[PDB]
Amino acid sequence: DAMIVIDGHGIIQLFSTAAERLFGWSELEAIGQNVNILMPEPDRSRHDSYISRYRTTSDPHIIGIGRIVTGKRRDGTTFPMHLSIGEMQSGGEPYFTGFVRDLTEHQQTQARLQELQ
Cis, bond preceding 42 (omega within 30 deg of 0): yes
Question: Shortest Cβ contact with ligand HEM: which residue?
Answer: 98
Residue 106 belongs to what H/E stretch?
A: helix 104-115
Chain breaks in the chain (C to N over 2.5 A) after: none
Smaller CB distance to ligand HEM: residue 65 or 117?
65
Residues of this chain that interact with ligand HEM (CB under 6 A) are: 4, 6, 35, 38-39, 43, 50-51, 54, 60-63, 69-71, 83, 85, 96-98
Taking the complex as a whole, the smallest distance from the CB of residue 116 to ligand HEM amounts, in Å, to: 30
Q: Is 47 within any annotated ligand binding site?
A: yes
CA distance 53 to 75: 30
Smaller CB distance to ligand HEM: residue 61 or 111?
61
Contact 2, 91 (CB under 8 A): no
Smaller CB distance to ligand HEM: residue 45 or 117?
45
Annotated binding site for heme: 47
Annotated binding site: 47
